Amino acid sequence: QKLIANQFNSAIGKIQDSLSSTPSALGKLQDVVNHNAQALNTLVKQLSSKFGAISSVLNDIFSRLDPPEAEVQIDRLITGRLQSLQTYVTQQLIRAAEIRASANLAATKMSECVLGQSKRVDFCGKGYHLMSFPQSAPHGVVFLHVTYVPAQEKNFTTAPAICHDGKAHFPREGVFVSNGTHWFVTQRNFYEPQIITTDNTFVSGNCDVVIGIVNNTVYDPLQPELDS
Amino acid sequence: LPVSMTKTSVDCTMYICGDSTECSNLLLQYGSFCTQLKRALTGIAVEQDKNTQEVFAQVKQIYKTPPIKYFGGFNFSQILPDPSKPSKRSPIEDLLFNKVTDLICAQKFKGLTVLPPLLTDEMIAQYTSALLAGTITSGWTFGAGPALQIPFPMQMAYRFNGIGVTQNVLYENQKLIANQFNSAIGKIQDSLSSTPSALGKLQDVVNHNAQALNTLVKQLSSKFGAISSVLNDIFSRLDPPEAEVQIDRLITGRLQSLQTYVTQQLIRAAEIRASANLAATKMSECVLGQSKRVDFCGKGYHLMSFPQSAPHGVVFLH
Amino acid sequence: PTWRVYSTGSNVFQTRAGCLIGAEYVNNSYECDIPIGAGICASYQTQSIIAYTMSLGAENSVAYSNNSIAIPTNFTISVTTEI
Ligand SMILES: *[C@@H]1O[C@H](CO)[C@@H](O[C@@H]2O[C@H](CO)[C@@H](O)[C@H](O)[C@H]2NC(C)=O)[C@H](O)[C@H]1NC(C)=O
Ligand SMILES: *[C@@H]1O[C@H](CO)[C@@H](O[C@@H]2O[C@H](CO)[C@@H](O)[C@H](O)[C@H]2NC(C)=O)[C@H](O)[C@H]1NC(C)=O
Ligand SMILES: *[C@@H]1O[C@H](CO)[C@@H](O[C@@H]2O[C@H](CO)[C@@H](O)[C@H](O)[C@H]2NC(C)=O)[C@H](O)[C@H]1NC(C)=O
Ligand SMILES: *[C@@H]1O[C@H](CO)[C@@H](O[C@@H]2O[C@H](CO)[C@@H](O)[C@H](O)[C@H]2NC(C)=O)[C@H](O)[C@H]1NC(C)=O
Ligand SMILES: *[C@@H]1O[C@H](CO)[C@@H](O[C@@H]2O[C@H](CO)[C@@H](O)[C@H](O)[C@H]2NC(C)=O)[C@H](O)[C@H]1NC(C)=O
Ligand SMILES: *[C@@H]1O[C@H](CO)[C@@H](O[C@@H]2O[C@H](CO)[C@@H](O)[C@H](O)[C@H]2NC(C)=O)[C@H](O)[C@H]1NC(C)=O
């Protein structure tokens, strides 16, 4: 418990420095803000376009020419500006679709990673999922995923089954390993050797059909008690 | 599953004006449409490479299969790389590449060009080979941390327990399961070689892009209400007082056509991005692990999956 | 607009994406910053700009055998961000 607590505290301590030091970790939200600002600024700047007219200012056009020519000039300007507005609206609709997709993904992630534990690989982090915590950021969410990663691995010699008294034994929930001399049964994700007994093995058939079976002994807990 | 789309670039001046300078001078007076169009096309181009990176570049290291290829009776010859051919591709990959395929010069002379991808086919093949080596030698352990070796029959026993069937079922039926797997791979190769309509999606993507480019090229033969579809004959046959109307109308028509092209490309890019995201999810949960979701990684109880690369897409064998 | 870079001093490289002038090709392979295309990409280090073929990652080989297994003996808790 103490080691796990210390590791978690160290990770949460380091995450703030990791966020602060790198100035491009929050690039998605900044990209959203920049895209909106650029679209609006471009729409503002389009008002200075002449679009084939004598001038981009309407008052002078009305004050200098007759209705027959002022009409065509202002029609040109009106057409150009309406085209600009329509382009802006279409681009906004496409960006809204993209943001809706991202929001649906965020909702699914908060439902499955924060409100429960997920068995989906690489969905709530890199590794084996434990839990997640949400935080709010301008125009978005930030998930902190806690993950179990194995380390300090060791080699061993394995065997599919153990033949004893003309019977084949298989592990209920573990794997058979050997350190060179003796055989043990251990869980597949953490090394914890144990003595092969009848409690942690089950029998199925004789031992002349399984390729790679290994001779050894299985210790029955009942005999020492009934012999004492 | 399609992953990427063809990257295109468009030159404004050569499309709208061509070889006329006064047309360029007038075009300077219609705003910053070209900056918008170029920016959108560049964004799509970068997004394509991002899609390919997300789908394929998921393993930190490049794993290699052992020199001796014995895996408990399973063959794996039809999906592992072949060292004889220079491209270093599996047979299935070779069929997939050979099954999906002056107009380019005509398009180029009008200002429409195609940019090359960042990742060549050899690099994608190398990534797929690394994924296959990892899933054969290690299992699902290489996607959750360091890669740990485990014999293949024991991996299949674990995957049998994952679907509610005990280990003895595999261990007493090893040869039958191996023979069924080998026959299934052979039938997959034969069926892929025989039927030519299996690769319809990628061909559809390619055809749609080509058709859009052809329509854009053919829009230059329209008059839009002017007196001719060529700028030089308009400028050489009228006075500057009256040529402006014709040139303005032609320019507006061509700008509208090119805007429509850009909008269609944006919508198609959104669809391809959705497909690429689905492909990345499938690579994460069907190849790097075992999935309990029904019908996500095939019809039946999922055991495993193998990736292969195809032109602008991925092929999963479940 | 009259800024041509002639030759030699900036070197000339023929890639599949075009002609590169100003960068020197190197035989090394690095995880690169500025993508150019066709697997060729550039960076800044020597002092000058260098172009190279990007490296996909470190080569690894897993000791596969009929009767060899690897089992962890320790663990690590990791906290990761997703925005
Ligand atoms: C398990 O055994 C394998 C092979 O016996 C080890 O892989 C070797 O590691 C050494 C490093 O000490 C290298 O010099 C060899 O080239 C490796 N051989 C192969 C075939 O890859 C592996 O290191 C062992 N595992 C542990 C945790 O020590
Ligand atoms: C394999 O593991 C067994 C069990 O831990 C080891 O046997 C013990 O080894 C220690 C080390 O000297 C002795 O003090 C014990 O008395 C041994 N117990 C028994 C029941 O034999 C064995 O030495 C290990 N083998 C190797 C090669 O490390
Ligand atoms: C495991 O034990 C069995 C039986 O104890 C061994 O099978 C015997 O091997 C001897 C050879 O020394 C033969 O003479 C016998 O006919 C075999 N059968 C029996 C019932 O004794 C077997 O060799 C041992 N080792 C392995 C790897 O299975
Ligand atoms: C244990 O592995 C070895 C290989 O490391 C197997 O021996 C044969 O090795 C050759 C190498 O040229 C392969 O082509 C064969 O496929 C391997 N098997 C056979 C039956 O020849 C050996 O078979 C493996 N052990 C068992 C019990 O299958
Ligand atoms: C894996 O399958 C391939 C076929 O895809 C086998 O190669 C064939 O071997 C037979 C020998 O009976 C030849 O007649 C065929 O011409 C071979 N085909 C090809 C494409 O090479 C290969 O032998 C199988 N693997 C093993 C270990 O047997
Ligand atoms: C498992 O790993 C932890 C660290 O991840 C090890 O704890 C470290 O042990 C060394 C040596 O005693 C100390 O110098 C460190 O300060 C410890 N770290 C922490 C965070 O307490 C632990 O010893 C490892 N366990 C095994 C069995 O190897």
PDB file of C-alpha atoms in Angstrom, chain B residues 57-263:
ATOM      1  CA  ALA B  57       2.461   4.269 -35.765  1.00  0.00           C
ATOM      2  CA  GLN B  58       1.303   2.691 -32.512  1.00  0.00           C
ATOM      3  CA  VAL B  59       4.342   0.594 -31.484  1.00  0.00           C
ATOM      4  CA  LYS B  60       7.426   2.307 -30.086  1.00  0.00           C
ATOM      5  CA  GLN B  61       9.814  -0.427 -31.247  1.00  0.00           C
ATOM      6  CA  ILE B  62      10.272  -2.481 -34.409  1.00  0.00           C
ATOM      7  CA  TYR B  63      10.099  -6.173 -33.525  1.00  0.00           C
ATOM      8  CA  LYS B  64      11.474  -9.047 -35.592  1.00  0.00           C
ATOM      9  CA  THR B  65      10.351 -12.648 -35.907  1.00  0.00           C
ATOM     10  CA  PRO B  66      12.860 -15.360 -34.926  1.00  0.00           C
ATOM     11  CA  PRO B  67      14.985 -16.873 -37.711  1.00  0.00           C
ATOM     12  CA  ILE B  68      13.341 -20.278 -37.150  1.00  0.00           C
ATOM     13  CA  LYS B  69       9.627 -20.125 -37.982  1.00  0.00           C
ATOM     14  CA  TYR B  70       7.997 -22.834 -35.884  1.00  0.00           C
ATOM     15  CA  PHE B  71       4.847 -21.814 -34.005  1.00  0.00           C
ATOM     16  CA  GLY B  72       3.248 -25.053 -32.881  1.00  0.00           C
ATOM     17  CA  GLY B  73       1.960 -26.064 -36.306  1.00  0.00           C
ATOM     18  CA  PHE B  74       0.612 -22.678 -37.376  1.00  0.00           C
ATOM     19  CA  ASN B  75       2.159 -21.533 -40.645  1.00  0.00           C
ATOM     20  CA  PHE B  76       1.854 -17.713 -40.925  1.00  0.00           C
ATOM     21  CA  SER B  77       3.712 -17.784 -44.253  1.00  0.00           C
ATOM     22  CA  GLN B  78       1.021 -15.907 -46.198  1.00  0.00           C
ATOM     23  CA  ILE B  79       1.123 -12.848 -43.911  1.00  0.00           C
ATOM     24  CA  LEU B  80       4.791 -12.539 -42.885  1.00  0.00           C
ATOM     25  CA  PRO B  81       7.218 -10.582 -45.091  1.00  0.00           C
ATOM     26  CA  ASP B  82       8.906 -12.291 -48.029  1.00  0.00           C
ATOM     27  CA  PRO B  83      12.647 -11.493 -48.212  1.00  0.00           C
ATOM     28  CA  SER B  84      13.063 -12.494 -51.873  1.00  0.00           C
ATOM     29  CA  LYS B  85      11.110  -9.602 -53.376  1.00  0.00           C
ATOM     30  CA  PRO B  86      12.715  -6.145 -52.993  1.00  0.00           C
ATOM     31  CA  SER B  87       9.521  -4.546 -51.658  1.00  0.00           C
ATOM     32  CA  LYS B  88       9.554  -6.894 -48.622  1.00  0.00           C
ATOM     33  CA  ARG B  89       5.822  -7.592 -48.648  1.00  0.00           C
ATOM     34  CA  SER B  90       3.674 -10.584 -47.806  1.00  0.00           C
ATOM     35  CA  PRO B  91       1.822 -12.406 -50.611  1.00  0.00           C
ATOM     36  CA  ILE B  92      -1.552 -11.021 -49.495  1.00  0.00           C
ATOM     37  CA  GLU B  93      -0.089  -7.511 -49.519  1.00  0.00           C
ATOM     38  CA  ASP B  94       1.223  -8.095 -53.046  1.00  0.00           C
ATOM     39  CA  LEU B  95      -2.215  -9.156 -54.286  1.00  0.00           C
ATOM     40  CA  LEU B  96      -3.801  -6.154 -52.569  1.00  0.00           C
ATOM     41  CA  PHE B  97      -1.336  -3.720 -54.149  1.00  0.00           C
ATOM     42  CA  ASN B  98      -1.664  -5.276 -57.606  1.00  0.00           C
ATOM     43  CA  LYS B  99      -5.480  -5.285 -57.403  1.00  0.00           C
ATOM     44  CA  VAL B 100      -6.025  -1.560 -56.688  1.00  0.00           C
ATOM     45  CA  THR B 101      -4.798   0.927 -59.288  1.00  0.00           C
ATOM     46  CA  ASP B 102      -1.534  12.116 -70.236  1.00  0.00           C
ATOM     47  CA  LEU B 103      -4.456  13.177 -68.057  1.00  0.00           C
ATOM     48  CA  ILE B 104      -2.017  13.957 -65.237  1.00  0.00           C
ATOM     49  CA  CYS B 105      -0.051  16.304 -67.497  1.00  0.00           C
ATOM     50  CA  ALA B 106      -3.236  18.028 -68.665  1.00  0.00           C
ATOM     51  CA  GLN B 107      -4.289  18.571 -65.054  1.00  0.00           C
ATOM     52  CA  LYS B 108      -0.816  19.801 -64.089  1.00  0.00           C
ATOM     53  CA  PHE B 109      -0.730  22.391 -66.866  1.00  0.00           C
ATOM     54  CA  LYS B 110      -3.862  23.979 -65.346  1.00  0.00           C
ATOM     55  CA  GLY B 111      -2.373  24.350 -61.858  1.00  0.00           C
ATOM     56  CA  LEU B 112      -3.691  21.185 -60.175  1.00  0.00           C
ATOM     57  CA  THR B 113      -0.961  19.028 -58.637  1.00  0.00           C
ATOM     58  CA  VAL B 114      -0.726  16.007 -56.338  1.00  0.00           C
ATOM     59  CA  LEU B 115       1.724  15.938 -53.399  1.00  0.00           C
ATOM     60  CA  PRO B 116       3.522  12.792 -52.201  1.00  0.00           C
ATOM     61  CA  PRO B 117       2.810  11.182 -48.822  1.00  0.00           C
ATOM     62  CA  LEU B 118       5.159  11.446 -45.873  1.00  0.00           C
ATOM     63  CA  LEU B 119       5.288   7.682 -45.256  1.00  0.00           C
ATOM     64  CA  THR B 120       6.268   5.469 -48.172  1.00  0.00           C
ATOM     65  CA  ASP B 121       4.791   2.007 -48.663  1.00  0.00           C
ATOM     66  CA  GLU B 122       7.942   0.331 -47.335  1.00  0.00           C
ATOM     67  CA  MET B 123       7.596   2.100 -43.980  1.00  0.00           C
ATOM     68  CA  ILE B 124       3.943   1.071 -43.611  1.00  0.00           C
ATOM     69  CA  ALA B 125       4.899  -2.504 -44.480  1.00  0.00           C
ATOM     70  CA  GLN B 126       7.624  -2.343 -41.826  1.00  0.00           C
ATOM     71  CA  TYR B 127       5.114  -1.141 -39.225  1.00  0.00           C
ATOM     72  CA  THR B 128       2.726  -3.977 -40.094  1.00  0.00           C
ATOM     73  CA  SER B 129       5.576  -6.494 -39.886  1.00  0.00           C
ATOM     74  CA  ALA B 130       6.500  -5.149 -36.448  1.00  0.00           C
ATOM     75  CA  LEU B 131       2.899  -5.506 -35.275  1.00  0.00           C
ATOM     76  CA  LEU B 132       2.707  -9.083 -36.578  1.00  0.00           C
ATOM     77  CA  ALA B 133       6.006 -10.030 -34.933  1.00  0.00           C
ATOM     78  CA  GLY B 134       4.837  -8.563 -31.638  1.00  0.00           C
ATOM     79  CA  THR B 135       1.481 -10.328 -31.712  1.00  0.00           C
ATOM     80  CA  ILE B 136       3.070 -13.675 -32.618  1.00  0.00           C
ATOM     81  CA  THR B 137       5.991 -13.631 -30.168  1.00  0.00           C
ATOM     82  CA  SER B 138       4.477 -11.723 -27.227  1.00  0.00           C
ATOM     83  CA  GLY B 139       0.663 -11.660 -27.350  1.00  0.00           C
ATOM     84  CA  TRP B 140      -1.145  -8.628 -25.949  1.00  0.00           C
ATOM     85  CA  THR B 141       1.712  -7.791 -23.570  1.00  0.00           C
ATOM     86  CA  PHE B 142       3.507  -5.519 -26.048  1.00  0.00           C
ATOM     87  CA  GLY B 143       0.614  -3.039 -26.118  1.00  0.00           C
ATOM     88  CA  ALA B 144       0.452  -2.527 -22.340  1.00  0.00           C
ATOM     89  CA  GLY B 145       4.176  -2.138 -21.680  1.00  0.00           C
ATOM     90  CA  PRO B 146       7.256  -4.263 -22.315  1.00  0.00           C
ATOM     91  CA  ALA B 147       7.012  -7.278 -24.596  1.00  0.00           C
ATOM     92  CA  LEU B 148       7.113 -10.642 -22.813  1.00  0.00           C
ATOM     93  CA  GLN B 149       7.642 -13.883 -24.703  1.00  0.00           C
ATOM     94  CA  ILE B 150       5.131 -16.725 -24.468  1.00  0.00           C
ATOM     95  CA  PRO B 151       4.744 -19.884 -26.595  1.00  0.00           C
ATOM     96  CA  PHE B 152       1.992 -19.617 -29.182  1.00  0.00           C
ATOM     97  CA  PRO B 153      -0.142 -22.601 -28.035  1.00  0.00           C
ATOM     98  CA  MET B 154      -0.238 -21.113 -24.530  1.00  0.00           C
ATOM     99  CA  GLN B 155      -1.346 -17.802 -26.034  1.00  0.00           C
ATOM    100  CA  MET B 156      -4.145 -19.643 -27.828  1.00  0.00           C
ATOM    101  CA  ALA B 157      -5.075 -21.350 -24.549  1.00  0.00           C
ATOM    102  CA  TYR B 158      -5.373 -17.955 -22.863  1.00  0.00           C
ATOM    103  CA  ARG B 159      -7.484 -16.691 -25.761  1.00  0.00           C
ATOM    104  CA  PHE B 160      -9.696 -19.778 -25.454  1.00  0.00           C
ATOM    105  CA  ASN B 161     -10.218 -19.059 -21.753  1.00  0.00           C
ATOM    106  CA  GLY B 162     -11.120 -15.519 -22.778  1.00  0.00           C
ATOM    107  CA  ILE B 163     -14.238 -16.787 -24.579  1.00  0.00           C
ATOM    108  CA  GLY B 164     -15.398 -19.325 -21.988  1.00  0.00           C
ATOM    109  CA  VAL B 165     -13.645 -22.493 -23.213  1.00  0.00           C
ATOM    110  CA  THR B 166     -11.118 -24.367 -21.091  1.00  0.00           C
ATOM    111  CA  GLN B 167      -7.476 -25.015 -21.981  1.00  0.00           C
ATOM    112  CA  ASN B 168      -7.787 -28.776 -22.439  1.00  0.00           C
ATOM    113  CA  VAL B 169      -9.997 -28.163 -25.475  1.00  0.00           C
ATOM    114  CA  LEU B 170      -7.051 -26.533 -27.234  1.00  0.00           C
ATOM    115  CA  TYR B 171      -4.330 -28.806 -25.883  1.00  0.00           C
ATOM    116  CA  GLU B 172      -6.087 -32.005 -27.011  1.00  0.00           C
ATOM    117  CA  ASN B 173      -7.088 -30.553 -30.406  1.00  0.00           C
ATOM    118  CA  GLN B 174      -3.913 -28.739 -31.440  1.00  0.00           C
ATOM    119  CA  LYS B 175      -3.408 -30.330 -34.865  1.00  0.00           C
ATOM    120  CA  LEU B 176      -7.053 -29.940 -35.900  1.00  0.00           C
ATOM    121  CA  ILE B 177      -7.074 -26.256 -34.935  1.00  0.00           C
ATOM    122  CA  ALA B 178      -3.788 -25.652 -36.758  1.00  0.00           C
ATOM    123  CA  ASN B 179      -5.082 -27.358 -39.908  1.00  0.00           C
ATOM    124  CA  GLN B 180      -8.318 -25.356 -39.795  1.00  0.00           C
ATOM    125  CA  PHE B 181      -6.341 -22.118 -39.420  1.00  0.00           C
ATOM    126  CA  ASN B 182      -4.059 -22.976 -42.343  1.00  0.00           C
ATOM    127  CA  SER B 183      -6.990 -23.917 -44.581  1.00  0.00           C
ATOM    128  CA  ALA B 184      -8.783 -20.692 -43.651  1.00  0.00           C
ATOM    129  CA  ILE B 185      -5.738 -18.589 -44.563  1.00  0.00           C
ATOM    130  CA  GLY B 186      -5.419 -20.411 -47.882  1.00  0.00           C
ATOM    131  CA  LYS B 187      -9.091 -19.875 -48.696  1.00  0.00           C
ATOM    132  CA  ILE B 188      -8.741 -16.194 -47.794  1.00  0.00           C
ATOM    133  CA  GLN B 189      -5.850 -15.842 -50.239  1.00  0.00           C
ATOM    134  CA  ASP B 190      -7.744 -17.670 -52.994  1.00  0.00           C
ATOM    135  CA  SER B 191     -10.975 -15.703 -52.483  1.00  0.00           C
ATOM    136  CA  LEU B 192      -9.088 -12.403 -52.433  1.00  0.00           C
ATOM    137  CA  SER B 193      -7.294 -13.345 -55.657  1.00  0.00           C
ATOM    138  CA  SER B 194     -10.480 -14.487 -57.406  1.00  0.00           C
ATOM    139  CA  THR B 195     -13.145 -11.870 -56.694  1.00  0.00           C
ATOM    140  CA  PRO B 196     -12.088  -8.399 -57.938  1.00  0.00           C
ATOM    141  CA  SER B 197     -14.894  -6.402 -56.260  1.00  0.00           C
ATOM    142  CA  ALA B 198     -13.638  -6.915 -52.697  1.00  0.00           C
ATOM    143  CA  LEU B 199     -11.547  -3.710 -52.831  1.00  0.00           C
ATOM    144  CA  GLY B 200     -14.434  -1.463 -53.844  1.00  0.00           C
ATOM    145  CA  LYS B 201     -14.059   1.166 -51.122  1.00  0.00           C
ATOM    146  CA  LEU B 202     -10.492   2.265 -51.886  1.00  0.00           C
ATOM    147  CA  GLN B 203     -11.191   2.256 -55.623  1.00  0.00           C
ATOM    148  CA  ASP B 204     -14.270   4.385 -54.946  1.00  0.00           C
ATOM    149  CA  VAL B 205     -12.169   6.927 -53.041  1.00  0.00           C
ATOM    150  CA  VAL B 206      -9.643   7.133 -55.885  1.00  0.00           C
ATOM    151  CA  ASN B 207     -12.348   7.412 -58.548  1.00  0.00           C
ATOM    152  CA  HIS B 208     -14.213  10.132 -56.657  1.00  0.00           C
ATOM    153  CA  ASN B 209     -11.091  12.277 -56.320  1.00  0.00           C
ATOM    154  CA  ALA B 210     -10.265  11.820 -60.011  1.00  0.00           C
ATOM    155  CA  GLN B 211     -13.816  12.726 -61.034  1.00  0.00           C
ATOM    156  CA  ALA B 212     -13.737  15.896 -58.934  1.00  0.00           C
ATOM    157  CA  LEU B 213     -10.490  16.954 -60.606  1.00  0.00           C
ATOM    158  CA  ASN B 214     -11.918  16.222 -64.065  1.00  0.00           C
ATOM    159  CA  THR B 215     -15.014  18.319 -63.352  1.00  0.00           C
ATOM    160  CA  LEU B 216     -12.819  21.188 -62.167  1.00  0.00           C
ATOM    161  CA  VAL B 217     -10.783  20.968 -65.376  1.00  0.00           C
ATOM    162  CA  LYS B 218     -13.896  20.892 -67.572  1.00  0.00           C
ATOM    163  CA  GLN B 219     -15.378  23.969 -65.876  1.00  0.00           C
ATOM    164  CA  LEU B 220     -12.827  26.110 -67.762  1.00  0.00           C
ATOM    165  CA  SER B 221     -14.687  25.598 -71.061  1.00  0.00           C
ATOM    166  CA  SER B 222     -17.775  27.512 -69.888  1.00  0.00           C
ATOM    167  CA  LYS B 223     -18.531  31.118 -70.784  1.00  0.00           C
ATOM    168  CA  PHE B 224     -20.703  32.119 -67.792  1.00  0.00           C
ATOM    169  CA  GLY B 225     -22.493  34.576 -70.061  1.00  0.00           C
ATOM    170  CA  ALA B 226     -19.443  36.285 -71.576  1.00  0.00           C
ATOM    171  CA  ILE B 227     -18.579  36.271 -75.284  1.00  0.00           C
ATOM    172  CA  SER B 228     -15.841  33.609 -75.174  1.00  0.00           C
ATOM    173  CA  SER B 229     -14.105  31.179 -72.831  1.00  0.00           C
ATOM    174  CA  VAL B 230     -10.593  32.510 -73.536  1.00  0.00           C
ATOM    175  CA  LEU B 231      -9.197  35.646 -71.926  1.00  0.00           C
ATOM    176  CA  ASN B 232      -6.818  36.736 -74.688  1.00  0.00           C
ATOM    177  CA  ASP B 233      -9.579  36.975 -77.290  1.00  0.00           C
ATOM    178  CA  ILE B 234     -11.664  39.076 -74.896  1.00  0.00           C
ATOM    179  CA  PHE B 235      -8.791  41.475 -74.248  1.00  0.00           C
ATOM    180  CA  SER B 236      -7.731  41.685 -77.907  1.00  0.00           C
ATOM    181  CA  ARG B 237     -11.243  42.328 -79.272  1.00  0.00           C
ATOM    182  CA  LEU B 238     -12.714  44.937 -76.903  1.00  0.00           C
ATOM    183  CA  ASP B 239     -11.819  48.236 -75.264  1.00  0.00           C
ATOM    184  CA  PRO B 240     -10.872  48.310 -71.565  1.00  0.00           C
ATOM    185  CA  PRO B 241     -14.179  50.058 -70.799  1.00  0.00           C
ATOM    186  CA  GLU B 242     -16.144  46.952 -71.842  1.00  0.00           C
ATOM    187  CA  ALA B 243     -13.662  44.092 -71.324  1.00  0.00           C
ATOM    188  CA  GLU B 244     -13.925  44.544 -67.549  1.00  0.00           C
ATOM    189  CA  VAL B 245     -17.495  43.220 -67.406  1.00  0.00           C
ATOM    190  CA  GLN B 246     -16.624  40.049 -69.322  1.00  0.00           C
ATOM    191  CA  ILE B 247     -13.444  39.429 -67.331  1.00  0.00           C
ATOM    192  CA  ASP B 248     -15.251  39.999 -64.029  1.00  0.00           C
ATOM    193  CA  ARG B 249     -17.981  37.531 -64.934  1.00  0.00           C
ATOM    194  CA  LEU B 250     -15.491  34.852 -66.010  1.00  0.00           C
ATOM    195  CA  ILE B 251     -13.436  35.380 -62.841  1.00  0.00           C
ATOM    196  CA  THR B 252     -16.512  35.108 -60.623  1.00  0.00           C
ATOM    197  CA  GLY B 253     -17.586  31.881 -62.307  1.00  0.00           C
ATOM    198  CA  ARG B 254     -14.168  30.280 -61.949  1.00  0.00           C
ATOM    199  CA  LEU B 255     -13.805  31.364 -58.316  1.00  0.00           C
ATOM    200  CA  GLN B 256     -17.211  29.869 -57.520  1.00  0.00           C
ATOM    201  CA  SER B 257     -16.281  26.572 -59.182  1.00  0.00           C
ATOM    202  CA  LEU B 258     -13.019  26.329 -57.253  1.00  0.00           C
ATOM    203  CA  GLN B 259     -14.800  27.185 -53.983  1.00  0.00           C
ATOM    204  CA  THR B 260     -17.252  24.348 -54.616  1.00  0.00           C
ATOM    205  CA  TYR B 261     -14.315  21.992 -55.155  1.00  0.00           C
ATOM    206  CA  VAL B 262     -12.797  23.025 -51.820  1.00  0.00           C
ATOM    207  CA  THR B 263     -16.072  22.525 -49.929  1.00  0.00           C
TER     208      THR B 263
END
